[PDB]
Design an enzyme around this catalytic site. Structure first.
Site, PDB file in Angstrom:
ATOM      1  N   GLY A 125       0.798  -1.230   0.000  1.00 33.29           N
ATOM      2  CA  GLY A 125       0.000   0.000   0.000  1.00 33.29           C
ATOM      3  C   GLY A 125       0.826   1.274   0.000  1.00 33.29           C
ATOM      4  O   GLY A 125       2.055   1.221  -0.038  1.00 33.29           O
ATOM      5  N   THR A 126       0.146   2.421   0.052  1.00 33.13           N
ATOM      6  CA  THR A 126       0.832   3.716   0.154  1.00 33.13           C
ATOM      7  C   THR A 126       1.367   3.875   1.579  1.00 33.13           C
ATOM      8  O   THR A 126       1.051   3.073   2.456  1.00 33.13           O
ATOM      9  CB  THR A 126      -0.069   4.935  -0.190  1.00 33.13           C
ATOM     10  N   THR A 127       2.162   4.915   1.806  1.00 37.52           N
ATOM     11  CA  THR A 127       2.786   5.128   3.110  1.00 37.52           C
ATOM     12  C   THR A 127       1.888   5.962   4.019  1.00 37.52           C
ATOM     13  O   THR A 127       1.183   6.860   3.559  1.00 37.52           O
ATOM     14  CB  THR A 127       4.157   5.826   2.983  1.00 37.52           C
TER      15      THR A 127
END
Lengths: 195, 235, 111, 244, 243, 241, 250, 231, 240
Positions: free
Chosen positions: E29-31
Site C-alpha cells: 500500500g501507500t505510506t
C-alpha cells in the site's frame, strides 16, 4: 349446538344430536348434523363454541383417516377416544383452548361390543352406558337411570331415546328443532331418517 | 469443489454458465411479437409413444394478460411460475390494476441469482414471457437463470435455438399479422424439430389484448399445420 | 396509563367536478381547549396529481401521508415511472390502513 | 472455508449407491452374528458376543439383546453405542403410543419409525449413518408373532427366520435348509444354536459367548412373556441340545 | 504442506501463513505515519494521484473515531474502513456505559481483539491493513500501530506501507535528536517531510499530502485535519528538505 | 493430508495442530520463570524491545487478571491478549456468581478447559500460548499453575517456560535438591525477586539491565508488577552481593 | 464465524473402520497404564502418577476422580479429555438423575450416560472422538459392586478385572492368573499394587501411585451426623502414607 | 491459482483473485462515461443488445431526485446495489429530512462491497458503478469498484475500451470543468468522450443513454428520440 | 444446519446427484402400470434371491395414498416411505380444505414437487425413487396413470414401466398396447400386465404382485393363486 346424547345398548351405540343452529335471536338452520364419521365403525358427536366444534371435529376426523390409510387398519373406539382426550387435554392449556364437548360412539369389531365415551373440553373421559353433554343431562340421566337396561335391543334403545327427546321438548326452554339419530353397530353407521 | 457462487477468471459465474448448457439441451420454444398479438410455440418432444402428449405442459398462463413458455429442466419452472402467478395476483390486490409485463418479468428474474452457500443452485430453465399491458403494448421477454432479461421482437430457446434464431432474424418485420406469425412459428419449429412436426408433438398459443392468453386446441393447430404445408408447396 | 392517541381537531372536505376535484381543510390545529397552530396545513400534494388529507390524530395522519408519498415514489421506481391512478392509490391506501387493523391510524382519510 | 474437510456422507456413487451405507454394512459384517427364528408358538433370539475375555462379567452384561417394551425386543449387530441411542428413541416412541391410544404399539409401527430415523441420516444433515442392524422380535394382537430386520439404509423387511452380522450368507443357507413353517419354539431354539455353532469363527460354542431370549405366549393365557436367558439357563440349553 | 490455503491453520513452524499473506497486501500500500509529540499525536498519509481527474482534497483517507481519536492505515482501504466502523461502535458503546470518552489504550485493545478474532477461524479472512491510530486522553497522548495478526504496541513514531523502512529511519533520527519532546506544530512539519521522503519509494506517481492531529494545547484534545495556511507551511518545509 | 490442518486424530493418535500451536509458543523468543516465597509468588520474564520507535512501557507479557491473580504469557501477543481478556472476564464473573475471589488453580482449570475445547471442536484453532498463573491463594498459599494449548494444567513448586526452559528448570531443580524444601525460604518478596533474577542469570549465562526484565509479584491480597526503578534497585542489591 | 463444521468428522472407510475411533484407541494405547479389580466386598482402581517435571506438584494432578460418593473413575489416554468428562459426568449424575429421584444414579446408568456423551463425539458435526478409555468403579444398593470400561466409541463392558493403556496386555494376563471369585478387598489391593509394579519403570511409592477404593461406607467422611440413613461415601482415596504401609508387606 | 477458490483466501503476494475476477467482469461490460462541471454532472452510456431482434440493456438507474448511477458488468448486481442506495437515500429523507450527500453514498457502497470480500460463502459484486449527484456542495462524480474502492473524480469511464474516453477527458479537463449553467454542452463533451471508445459501430438512437443532474435539474434520463439531438 | 449444495451443475450442464438417483431407480425391482378401459393395473417385480421372507408383514410394493389412488415405485425403499407418508398427509389435508379428494394429476404434481425441491435445497440429496401413481379422480370413470422421477418431472402414460430391465418391458408394451384399443376389461388388462413382467421376471412364482384399481375407490390386491392362473394360461398359449 346444545343437545347431544348417546346410549349404548346390547349390540349398538345410538347418538342423538339437536338440529338447530341459533345465533342471537335467529335460528339460522334447523337441519344441522352435529356429527363426524371418524372411521367406518366410529362416530363422534360434538357441541360447544361456534367455529371450534367443527374445526375440532374435522381435525380429529382427518387425523383418524390418516391413521387408517397408513396402517390399513381401523383403530379401536377405545384408542380413538384416548387420542381425542389427549388432544383436548393439550388444548386446555393452550393460548386458546378449544371449547368443544364430544361423545364418541363406536363398535369394536375385535370384541364385538358397542362402546360409548363422554369427553368434555377439559379432556375428562369416561366410558358410560348412556351420556349427555350440557343441560340435557339434568333431565335425561334420571330418566335413563330408571328405564335403561344393559341388554336392550336397538329397537328398545330408540324408544328410550324418544322418551328423552320428549322430556327435553317439554321442559327445555329453547327450541332445539329435533334430533338426528344414528346407530353404530357391527355393520357400521346408518342414520334413522324419521324421528 | 469450490464455491457455488465462485467467479471464473474470465469474470463469469460457473454455475450460471453451466445452467446455460442444461438449457441448450431443452426442447425448442419460440416467440414472435406482432402489433396484433404475441405468439408462443413449443416442441413437446415425447420420449416414448406411450406417453400421452397432451399431459406435456410447456406453455403456461401467468395471468389473463401474460403467458409463458419454457425450455430446459422444466421441473425447475414450477416454482418460478408459482412466483409469477402470485406476483401478478398480488399486484392486482394492492393496486386494483393489471401488472406490467416488464414488472412481472423483473419479479421473476429477481429469484434467479438467489442461490449459493436461498436455494442450492441456479435454475436449469429459461422462459419466454409474453404479454400485453396498456403502457408498452405487446411484449416478449427472455428470462435467463443469470437474472437477466431481454425484450425481443422474436426469440428462440432450447436445442433448436441458434439455427431458429437466425431464421427469425430473416423473417421478422414490424408489420407481421398474427396469422403470419403463427405460421412462421410452425415453420421454424418443423425445421429444427427432431421428429416430424404435427399437432401432438408441438403446441401453439397467443395473447391478444382482446381475449387474453389462450393455448390452442389440437384441432385448431392441426389446420394451421395444413395451411402451412399448402402455402410452402405453392412456390 | 399512557394513552397513545389524541385529537388535533380540524375538518376537511372533498368535492368532485366533471374535469376537476377539490380537497379543502382548515389550517387550525388544536388539543383540548388550546390552539397549537393557526396555520398547520393538512391537505397535501402527493405527486401524480393526487391530493390527500388524513384528519384526526395528526401524528397518525402525518405518518400515513408520509408512508403514502413514499408508496408513490417506490411505485415509480418499481414500475417504469408509471403514473399511479386514483383507483390504484385508493386501494394501496386501504392496505396501509388495514395493515394497522389492530392498532389503527386514528384518521378519516380523503383523496 | 471448511468445505475442504467434508466427506459428503449423504451422496450417491455414480452407480447410485450410498457410499456410507455400503461401508456401514461392511462394518456390520464384522460384528457378532445374531439370529431370529419365528415359530408358530413363539420367537427365538440368539446372538454371539464379540470375542469375550475370561475376566468379563458375563451376567451383569448386555451387548446384543435389548428390551424395547413388554411385547418387543431387538438383537443388535454393529456399534453398541449407536444401537443404544436408537434403542432409547424406540423405547420412548413405544411409550408415546401407549400414552396416546392406551394400547401397546404394533410391532411394525415401531419398526417403521426407527427405520425412518435411520433413513433420515442418509438423505440430509451430512452426518455419518448409524453403524447398526437390528432384528426385531415381538408380538401384537394384529399379526401375532413378527420378525423384522432393519439396516443403516433405513430399509426393513419381515422374516420367518433371519441372521445379521458376521457370516449371514452362510447362516441364512443353513436356516433355509432346516426351517419349516409348523415348527415349535424348542425346535427353533435348537436350530438357532446349531446354526451359530456351524458359522462361529471361534473354536467351540460356549455359554459365556452367547446371549439368548424367547418371546412366548408361554406364560398364563393369551398374554405374552419375554425371557432374557441367564448364563446358567444358556449353559443348560447348550447341554440339553448336546452342543457341549 | 498446503498449510497456507486456510485462515487459522498452524504451519509446522507455528505460523499462520494467511495473516502473513495479508501483510504482503499491506506492504503493497501507500505510506502512512504517526508521530507522538509533547501533548498530542500527528497522522499523515501518502495519497497517490493516479490521474488529473481525481478531485484534489476530496478523497479523504484519515478517519476520526469519537471526537478525540485519529486513525490512518495502509493496505486494502475498504478493510480499514470496516475496522474504523467497528472502532466507532466500540467507542460509542464504551461512552454509553461509562460516560467518559474511551481511553486510547482501551481503544487499542478493542481493535486488537476484533482483528485477532479474524485470525481464529477459517471462514473469515484476516484484515488487509496496518492501522496507525491514537489521540489524547486523561493520561496524555498515545500513538499505536496495529497489524493483521492483531498485534499492536505503543509507539514514539510509527510507519507502514511501501515507504515504511525509509520513514522508520527518519523517525529514529527524530527520536534520538529530540530526547525531551517534539512540539505539536514541529511534528506536523516533520510528518510532512517524512511522507515526502518516503514518497521516494513510490515516485513514478506523484501524490497528495494529508495531515491531521490531536494536541491538548493546539486542538484542545480533539482531532482536527490540518488545512489551509498551516498545511501549506508544512508542504513548504518539506519542499525545502527534499532539495 | 488434512489430518494436519484441523484438530482431528492422526493415525498414530496425535493432534498436529496442537503440536504446532506449542511451536508458536516460543516464537517470541522470551523466557519466563516463577518461584514461591513464604509470603509471595514471583514471576519474571525477559523483556526484549528491538525497535527504537516502540514505547517500551507498552511492551509487556505480564497481566493483572484480578486484584489477586497475575498471569505471564509465553507466545504471540495477540493470542496472549485474547487469553488475558478472557481470564479477566472469567475471574470477574466468578466473583459475582459465587461471592468470593476466583482462586489461581480454578481459573487455571477453567482456562485449560476452554483450551481443551479448541482441541476437540474443529472450527476453533488452539491459542499459541502457555499461561502461567500466580497468586497467594487465601486457602492454598503461594500458588503457581500453568496452562498450555493441549488443554493440560498443573500446579508447580516453581516453573519456567520459553526456548531455554530446560536450562532454567534444571538450574531450579538443583537448588531445591539442595535446600531440601518446596520454596524460597525468605521473609520479604524483594529477596525472593532477587533470587528469581539471580537464578535466571546463572541459567541463561546473561546479565540483565533494568529494561531487559519484567517482574510481577503476588502477595496476600494484591498482585503487582514492578517499574524499571523497582527492578533497578533490585539489580543494584544483587550486584553488591 | 460460527461452526461451519456441521458435518461428521468421523466417517466409515470402504473397509468398514471408523478411522477416528481407531486412532483415539491408538492414543489410549500410548497412555499410562491404569487398572481395576473387583473384590467380593470392594473395588480398587489404580494408576501410575507419571510426572511433568520434578518441579510439578503431582498431588494437584489427581488422575483418580470421584463422580458420586459411591462411584470413582480413572483413565488412560489424553488427560484434558478426561478432565472435562469428569466435569460432565458429575453434572449428568445430578441433572438427569439425582434431581429427579433424590438419590444418586446406579453405576451402570451413569456409565451409560458417560458412554452416550462419548458416542456423540463420534457422530456430531465438527468434533473428534474423546481420546480416553475410562474405568468406572461403583456401588449401588440393588446391584452391589461393579467395574466398567468405557471406550472412545461409547462402548462399555463390565469386568471382574482389567487394565488399559501402555502395558495392558501384560497386565491383563497377570490379572487372569491371580483373580478368583473369593478375593476380599485387601487382597484385591495387594494384587493391583503387584500388577502395577510390572508396568512402572521409575520410582514406586505412595507419591508415584494414585489408588482409590469403592468399599465400606465411611461415616467419618460424611461431614455431618444426625441422619441414620445417610452413612457416608463408599469411595475413598488412599493417602500417600496408606499406600506405603501396604508396600512394606509387598 | 490455488488461491482463487473463494474470496476469503489471500494469495501469497497478497491478492484476492475472486475480487480481481469480479473486476474482470466490469471490463467485459459495455462502456459508460461520467463527467462534471461545477453546476451539472452527466452520465453517458453505450448500451448493448443481444442481436438485431433484442432490446438494449439499460445502464442508467435513478436513486433519488438528486442522484443516480450507471452500470458496467453484471446487471442484477447493479440492481441489488442501486436498490440499496435508493433505501439509504430514502432513509436520509424520511428520518432526517436531508438529502443524502453523494460522498456518503460512496462510503455506504464501499462498506457494503467490502463485507462480501471477507466472509466464507459470499462472492464480490461483479459490476462497476459511476455515481453522479448534486447535493449541498455542488456537482459530484464517483467511481465504484466491487473491490470496495470508491473515488471522486471530475470525469472517468468504465467498461470495455473505456481507456479512450479516459485519456480524452484527461486532455479536455480544463474545458469541460467550466461548462457551468449549460446542460447541452456538458452532454456534447460527454458524447464526444464516449466516441473515443467505439469500434466498427457508432452511436445510434436506441443505443445511447444519457443522464443529467445539477443545480436546477432533477436527475433525469434521456433515451431514444430525446438523444437524437446529440448524434 | 448442514448447508452444502450437493445437487449442483457440472460443466456439461448435468446435475450428477440427480442422474445418480436415476441409477438407483434403474437398480430397483421392476414396476409397471397399464390402463385399461375401466381400470388401471399396477404390477411389480419382487426379487426372489430372498426365501424365508414373511409376506404378511413385509412392506407391499403398491401403497394406498387415499382410498381411490395408489402409488408404486422403483429405487431405494426407505426413500419411498418418506414420499408415501407426505402424499398421504397431503391427501388428507386436501380433503379437509377443498372438501374433495385429490385428483390423480394433483397428487402426482405434489409428489413431483417434493422430489424437485430436494434437487435444489442445500444439505439434501435427491430421492433415489421413481413412482407410478394411478387411480380415478372423484366421481370420474376415466382411468389415470402418471410417472414421476427424481428430477421432479412427471407426465401421463397409457402404460409405463420403471426399474431394472424396464427398457425390455417398455419394448414389449410399445408393440403390445393399442392406444386405439385399450384392454376392454380388467381380465384383459391384468393379462397384458403379467405378460410384460414375464418378459423380465422368472417363474411367475412369488415374483409378481398385481393390484387392480377401479372407479369409486375400488382397489384390490390379487393372491398367489389368482396371479398363478394368469401365469399358467400365458405359457400354454406360448407353445404355438
Amino acid at each position: 349446538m346444545d343437545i347431544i346424547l348417546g346410549i349404548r345398548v346390547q349390540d349398538s351405540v345410538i347418538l342423538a344430536s339437536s338440529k338447530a343452529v341459533t345465533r342471537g335471536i335467529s335460528v339460522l338452520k334447523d337441519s344441522d348434523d352435529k356429527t363426524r364419521q371418524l372411521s367406518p365403525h366410529t362416530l363422534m358427536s360434538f357441541a360447544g363454541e361456534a367455529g371450534d366444534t367443527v374445526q375440532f371435529a374435522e381435525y380429529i376426523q382427518a387425523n383418524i383417516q390418516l391413521y387408517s390409510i397408513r396402517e390399513d387398519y381401523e383403530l379401536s373406539p377405545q384408542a380413538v377416544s384416548s387420542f381425542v382426550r389427549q388432544e383436548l387435554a393439550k388444548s386446555i392449556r393452550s393460548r386458546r383452548p378449544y371449547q368443544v364437548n364430544v361423545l364418541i360412539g363406536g363398535y369394536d369389531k375385535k370384541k364385538n361390543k358397542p362402546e360409548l365415551y363422554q369427553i368434555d373440553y377439559l379432556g375428562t373421559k369416561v366410558e358410560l352406558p348412556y351420556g349427555a353433554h350440557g343441560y340435557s343431562g339434568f333431565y335425561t340421566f334420571s330418566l335413563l337411570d330408571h328405564h335403561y337396561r344393559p341388554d336392550m335391543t336397538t329397537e328398545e334403545g330408540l324408544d328410550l331415546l324418544k322418551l328423552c327427546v320428549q322430556e327435553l321438548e317439554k321442559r327445555m326452554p329453547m327450541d332445539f328443532k329435533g334430533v338426528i339419530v344414528k346407530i353404530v353397530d357391527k355393520d357400521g353407521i346408518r342414520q334413522v331418517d324419521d324421528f | 469443489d469450490r464455491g457455488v457462487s465462485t467467479f471464473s477468471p474470465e469474470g463469469r459465474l460457473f454455475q450460471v454458465e453451466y445452467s446455460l448448457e442444461a438449457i441448450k439441451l431443452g426442447s425448442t420454444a419460440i416467440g414472435i411479437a406482432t402489433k396484433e398479438g404475441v405468439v408462443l410455440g413449443v416442441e413437446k418432444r415425447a420420449t416414448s409413444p406411450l406417453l400421452e402428449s397432451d399431459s406435456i405442459e410447456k406453455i403456461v398462463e401467468i395471468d389473463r394478460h401474460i403467458g409463458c413458455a419454457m425450455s430446459g429442466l422444466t421441473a425447475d419452472a414450477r416454482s418460478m411460475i408459482e412466483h409469477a402467478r402470485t406476483a401478478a395476483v398480488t399486484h392486482n390486490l394492492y393496486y386494483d390494476e393489471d401488472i406490467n409485463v416488464e414488472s412481472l418479468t423483473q419479479s421473476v428474474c429477481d429469484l434467479a441469482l438467489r442461490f449459493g452457500e436461498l436455494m442450492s443452485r441456479p435454475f436449469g430453465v429459461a422462459l419466454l414471457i409474453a404479454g400485453h399491458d396498456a403502457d408498452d403494448g405487446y411484449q416478449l421477454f427472455h428470462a435467463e437463470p443469470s437474472g437477466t432479461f431481454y425484450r425481443y421482437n422474436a426469440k428462440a430457446i432450447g436445442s433448436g435455438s441458434e439455427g431458429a434464431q437466425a431464421e427469425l432474424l430473416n423473417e421478422w418485420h414490424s408489420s407481421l399479422t398474427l396469422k403470419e406469425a403463427e405460421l412462421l412459428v410452425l415453420k421454424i419449429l418443423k425445421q429444427v424439430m427432431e421428429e416430424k412436426l404435427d399437432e401432438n408433438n408441438a403446441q401453439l398459443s397467443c395473447i391478444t389484448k382482446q381475449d387474453g392468453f389462450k393455448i390452442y386446441d389440437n384441432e385448431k393447430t392441426a389446420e394451421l399445420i395444413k395451411e402451412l404445408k399448402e402455402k410452402e408447396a405453392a412456390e | 396509563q399512557f394513552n397513545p392517541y389524541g385529537d388535533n381537531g380540524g375538518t376537511i372536505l372533498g368535492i368532485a367536478g366533471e374535469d376537476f376535484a377539490v380537497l379543502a381543510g382548515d389550517t387550525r390545529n388544536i388539543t383540548d381547549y388550546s390552539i397549537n397552530s393557526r396555520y398547520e396545513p393538512k391537505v397535501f400534494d402527493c405527486g401524480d396529481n393526487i391530493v390527500m388529507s388524513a384528519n384526526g390524530f395528526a401524528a397518525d395522519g402525518d405518518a400515513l401521508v408520509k408512508r403514502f408519498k413514499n408508496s408513490v415514489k417506490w411505485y415509480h421506481f418499481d414500475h417504469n415511472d408509471k403514473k399511479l391512478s386514483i383507483n390504484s392509490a385508493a386501494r394501496n391506501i386501504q392496505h396501509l390502513l388495514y395493515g394497522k387493523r389492530f392498532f389503527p391510524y386514528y384518521v378519516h382519510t380523503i383523496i | 472455508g471448511s468445505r475442504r474437510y467434508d466427506s459428503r456422507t449423504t451422496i450417491f456413487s455414480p452407480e447410485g449407491r450410498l457410499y456410507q451405507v455400503e461401508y456401514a454394512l461392511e462394518s456390520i459384517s464384522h460384528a457378532g452374528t445374531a439370529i431370529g427364528i419365528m415359530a408358530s408358538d413363539g420367537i427365538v433370539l440368539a446372538a454371539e458376543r464379540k470375542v469375550t475375555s475370561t475376566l468379563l462379567e458375563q451376567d451383569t452384561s448386555t451387548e446384543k439383546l435389548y428390551k424395547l417394551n413388554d411385547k418387543i425386543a431387538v438383537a443388535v449387530a454393529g456399534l453398541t453405542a449407536d444401537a443404544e441411542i436408537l434403542i432409547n428413541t424406540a423405547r420412548i416412541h413405544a411409550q408415546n403410543y401407549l400414552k396416546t391410544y392406551n394400547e401397546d404399539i404394533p410391532v411394525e409401527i415401531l419398526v417403521r419409525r426407527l427405520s425412518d430415523i435411520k433413513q433420515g441420516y442418509t438423505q440430509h444433515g451430512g452426518l455419518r449413518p448409524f453403524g447398526v442392524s437390528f432384528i426385531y422380535a415381538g408380538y401384537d394382537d394384529r399379526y401375532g408373532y413378527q420378525l423384522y430386520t432393519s439396516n443403516p439404509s433405513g430399509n426393513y423387511t419381515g422374516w420367518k427366520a433371519i441372521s445379521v452380522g458376521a457370516n449371514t450368507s452362510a447362516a441364512q443357507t443353513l436356516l433355509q435348509m432346516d426351517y419349516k413353517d409348523d415348527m415349535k419354539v424348542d425346535d427353533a431354539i435348537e436350530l438357532a444354536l446349531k446354526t451359530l455353532s456351524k458359522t462361529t469363527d471361534s473354536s467351540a460354542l460356549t455359554y459365556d459367548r452367547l446371549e439368548f431370549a424367547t418371546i412366548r405366549k408361554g406364560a398364563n393365557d393369551g398374554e405374552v412373556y419375554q425371557k432374557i436367558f441367564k448364563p446358567q439357563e444358556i449353559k443348560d440349553i447348550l447341554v440339553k441340545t448336546g452342543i457341549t | 504442506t498446503g498449510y497456507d490455503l486456510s485462515n487459522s491453520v498452524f504451519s509446522p513452524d507455528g505460523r499462520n501463513f494467511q495473516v502473513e499473506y495479508a501483510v504482503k497486501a499491506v506492504e503493497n500500500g501507500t505510506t502512512s505515519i504517526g508521530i507522538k509529540c509533547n501533548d498530542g499525536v500527528v497522522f499523515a498519509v501518502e495519497k497517490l494521484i493516479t490521474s488529473k481527474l481525481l478531485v484534489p482534497q476530496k478523497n479523504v483517507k484519515i478517519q476520526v473515531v469519537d471526537r478525540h481519536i485519529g486513525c490512518v492505515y495502509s493496505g486494502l482501504i475498504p478493510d480499514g474502513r470496516h475496522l474504523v466502523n467497528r472502532g466507532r461502535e466500540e467507542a460509542a458503546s464504551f461512552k454509553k456505559l461509562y460516560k467518559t470518552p474511551i481511553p486510547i489504550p482501551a481503544f487499542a485493545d478493542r481493535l486488537g481483539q476484533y482483528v485477532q478474532a479474524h485470525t481464529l477461524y477459517n471462514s473469515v479472512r484476516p484484515f488487509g491493513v496496518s492501522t496507525i491510530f491514537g489521540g489524547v486522553d486523561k493520561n496524555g497522548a498515545h500513538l499505536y500501530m496495529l497489524e493483521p495478526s492483531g498485534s499492536y504496541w505503543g509507539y514514539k513514531g510509527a510507519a507502514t506501507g511501501k515507504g515504511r523502512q525509509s520513514a522508520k529511519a527518519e523517525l529514529e533520527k527524530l527520536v534520538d535528536h529530540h530526547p525531551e519532546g517534539l512540539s505539536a506544530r514541529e511534528a506536523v512539519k516533520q510528518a510532512a517531510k517524512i511522507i515526502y521522503l518516503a514518497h521516494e519509494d513510490n515516485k513514478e506517481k506523484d501524490f497528495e499530502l494529508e495531515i491531521s492531529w490531536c494536541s491538548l494545547s493546539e486542538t484542545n484534545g480533539l482531532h482536527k485535519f490540518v488545512k489551509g495556511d498551516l498545511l501549506q507551511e508544512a508542504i513548504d518545509f518539506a519542499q525545502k528538505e527534499i532539495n | 493430508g488434512y489430518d494436519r490442518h484441523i484438530t482431528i486424530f492422526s493415525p498414530e493418535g496425535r493432534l498436529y495442530q496442537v503440536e504446532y500451536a506449542f511451536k508458536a509458543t516460543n516464537q517470541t523468543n522470551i523466557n519466563s520463570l516463577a518461584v514461591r516465597g513464604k509470603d509471595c509468588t514471583v514471576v519474571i520474564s525477559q523483556k526484549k524491545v528491538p525497535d527504537k520507535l516502540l514505547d517500551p512501557t507498552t511492551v509487556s507479557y505480564i497481566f493483572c487478571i484480578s486484584r489477586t491473580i497475575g498471569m505471564v504469557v509465553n507466545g504471540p501477543i495477540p493470542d496472549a491478549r485474547n487469553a488475558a481478556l478472557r481470564a479477566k472476564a472469567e475471574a470477574a464473573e466468578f466473583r459475582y456468581k459465587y461471592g468470593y475471589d476466583m482462586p489461581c488453580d480454578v481459573l487455571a482449570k477453567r482456562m485449560a478447559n476452554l483450551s481443551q475445547i479448541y482441541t476437540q471442536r474443529a472450527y476453533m484453532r488452539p491459542l499459541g500460548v502457555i499461561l502461567t498463573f500466580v497468586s497467594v491463594d487465601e486457602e492454598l498459599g503461594p500458588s503457581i499453575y500453568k496452562t498450555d494449548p493441549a488443554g493440560y494444567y498443573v500446579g508447580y513448586k516453581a516453573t519456567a517456560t520459553g526456548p531455554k526452559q530446560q536450562e532454567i528448570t534444571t538450574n531450579l531443580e538443583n537448588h531445591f535438591k539442595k535446600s531440601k524444601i518446596d520454596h524460597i525460604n525468605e521473609e520479604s518478596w524483594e529477596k525472593v525477586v532477587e533470587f528469581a533474577i539471580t537464578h535466571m542469570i546463572d541459567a541463561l549465562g546473561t546479565e540483565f539491565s533494568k529494561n531487559d526484565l519484567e517482574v510481577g509479584v503476588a502477595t496476600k491480597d494484591k498482585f503487582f508488577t514492578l517499574s524499571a526503578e523497582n527492578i533497578e534497585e533490585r539489580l543494584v542489591a544483587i550486584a553488591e552481593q | 464465524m460460527t461452526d461451519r463444521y456441521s458435518f461428521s468428522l468421523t466417517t466409515f472407510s470402504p473397509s468398514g473402520k471408523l478411522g477416528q475411533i481407531d486412532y483415539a484407541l491408538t492414543a489410549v494405547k500410548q497412555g499410562v497404564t491404569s487398572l481395576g479389580i473387583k473384590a467380593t466386598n470392594g473395588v480398587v482402581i489404580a494408576t501410575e502418577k507419571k510426572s511433568s517435571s520434578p518441579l510439578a506438584m503431582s498431588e494437584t494432578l489427581s488422575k483418580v476422580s470421584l463422580l458420586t460418593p459411591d462411584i470413582g473413575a480413572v483413565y488412560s489416554g489424553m488427560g484434558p479429555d478426561y478432565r472435562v468428562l469428569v466435569d460432565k459426568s458429575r453434572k449428568v449424575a445430578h441433572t438427569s438423575y439425582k434431581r429427579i429421584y433424590g438419590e444418586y444414579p446406579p453405576t451402570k446408568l451413569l456409565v451409560s450416560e458417560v458412554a452416550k456423551i462419548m458416542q456423540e463425539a463420534t457422530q456430531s458435526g465438527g468434533v473428534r472422538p474423546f481420546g480416553v478409555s475410562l474405568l468406572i468403579a461403583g456401588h449401588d444398593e440393588f446391584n452391589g459392586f461393579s467395574l466398567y470400561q468405557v471406550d472412545p466409541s461409547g462402548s462399555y463392558f463390565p469386568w471382574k478385572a482389567t487394565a488399559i493403556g501402555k502395558g495392558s496386555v501384560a497386565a491383563k494376563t497377570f490379572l487372569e492368573k491371580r483373580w478368583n471369585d473369593e478375593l476380599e478387598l485387601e487382597d484385591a489391593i495387594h494384587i493391583a499394587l503387584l500388577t502395577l509394579k510390572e508396568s512402572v519403570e521409575g520410582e514406586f511409592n505412595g507419591d508415584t501411585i494414585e489408588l482409590a477404593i469403592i468399599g465400606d461406607e465411611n461415616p467419618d467422611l460424611l461431614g455431618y451426623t444426625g441422619i441414620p440413613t445417610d452413612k457416608g461415601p463408599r469411595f475413598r482415596k488412599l493417602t500417600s502414607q496408606e499406600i506405603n504401609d501396604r508396600l512394606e508387606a509387598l | 491459482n490455488n488461491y482463487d477458490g473463494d474470496t476469503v483466501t489471500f494469495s501469497p503476494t497478497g491478492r484476492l483473485f475472486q475480487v480481481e475476477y469480479a473486476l474482470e467482469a466490469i471490463k467485459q461490460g459495455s462502456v459508460t462515461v461520467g463527467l462534471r462541471s461545477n453546476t451539472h454532472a452527466v452520465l453517458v452510456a453505450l448500451k448493448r443488445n443481444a442481436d438485431e431482434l433484442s432490446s438494449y440493456q439499460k445502464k442508467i438507474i435513478k436513486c433519488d431526485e438528486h442522484m443516480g448511477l450507471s452500470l458496467a458488468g453484471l446487471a442484477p448486481d447493479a440492481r441489488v446495489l442501486s436498490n440499496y442506495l435508493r433505501q439509504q437515500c430514502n432513509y436520509s429523507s424520511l428520518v432526517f429530512n436531508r438529502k443524502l450527500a453523494v460522498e456518503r453514498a460512496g462510503h455506504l457502497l464501499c462498506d457494503k462491497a467490502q463485507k462480501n470480500t471477507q466472509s466464507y460463502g459470499g462472492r464480490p459484486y461483479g459490476v462497476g458503478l459511476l455515481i453522479i449527484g448534486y447535493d449541498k456542495s455542488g456537482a459530484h462524480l464517483l467511481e465504484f469498484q466491487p473491490s470496495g474502492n470508491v473515488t471522486e473524480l471530475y470525469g472517468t469511464a468504465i467498461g470495455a475500451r473505456s481507456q479512450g474516453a479516459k485519456t480524452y477527458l484527461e486532455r479536455t479537463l480544463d474545458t469541460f470543468i467550466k461548462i457551468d449553467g449549460n446542460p447541452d454542452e456538458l452532454i456534447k463533451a460527454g458524447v464526444e468522450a464516449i466516441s473515443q471508445s467505439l469500434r466498427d459501430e457508432s452511436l445510434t438512437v436506441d443505443n445511447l443513454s444519457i443522464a443529467i443532474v445539477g443545480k436546477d435539474t432533477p436527475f433525469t434520463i434521456y433515451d431514444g428520440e430525446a438523444v437524437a439531438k446529440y448524434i | 444446519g448442514y448447508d452444502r449444495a450437493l445437487s449442483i451443475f457440472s460443466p456439461d450442464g448435468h446435475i450428477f446427484q440427480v442422474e445418480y438417483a436415476l441409477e438407483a431407480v434403474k437398480r430397483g425391482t421392476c414396476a409397471v402400470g397399464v390402463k385399461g378401459k375401466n381400470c388401471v393395473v399396477l404390477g411389480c417385480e419382487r426379487r426372489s434371491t430372498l426365501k424365508l421372507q414373511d409376506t404378511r408383514i413385509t412392506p407391499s410394493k403398491v401403497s394406498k395414498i387415499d382410498s381411490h389412488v395408489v402409488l408404486s415405485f422403483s429405487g431405494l425403499n426407505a426413500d419411498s416411505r418418506i414420499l408415501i407418508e407426505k402424499a398421504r398427509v397431503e391427501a388428507q389435508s386436501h380433503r379437509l380444505t377443498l372438501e374433495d379428494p385429490v385428483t390423480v394429476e394433483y397428487l402426482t404434481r405434489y409428489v413431483a414437487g417434493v422430489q424437485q425441491r430436494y434437487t435444489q435445497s442445500g444439505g439434501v440429496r435427491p430421492f433415489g425413487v421413481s413412482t407410478l401413481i394411478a387411480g380415478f379422480d372423484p366421481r370420474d370413470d376415466e382411468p389415470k396413470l402418471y410417472q414421476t422421477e427424481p428430477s421432479g418431472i412427471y407426465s401421463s402414460w397409457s402404460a409405463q414401466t420403471i426399474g431394472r430391465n424396464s427398457k425390455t418391458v417398455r419394448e414389449f408394451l410399445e408393440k403390445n398396447y393399442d392406444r386405439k384399443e385399450p384392454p376392454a376389461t380388467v381380465e384383459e388388462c391384468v393379462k397384458l400386465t403379467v405378460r410384460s413382467l414375464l418378459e423380465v421376471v422368472q417363474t411367475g412364482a412369488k415374483n409378481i404382485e398385481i393390484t387392480v384399481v377401479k372407479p369409486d375407490s375400488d382397489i384390490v390386491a390379487l393372491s398367489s393363486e389368482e396371479i398363478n392362473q394368469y401365469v399358467t394360461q400365458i405359457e400354454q398359449e406360448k407353445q404355438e
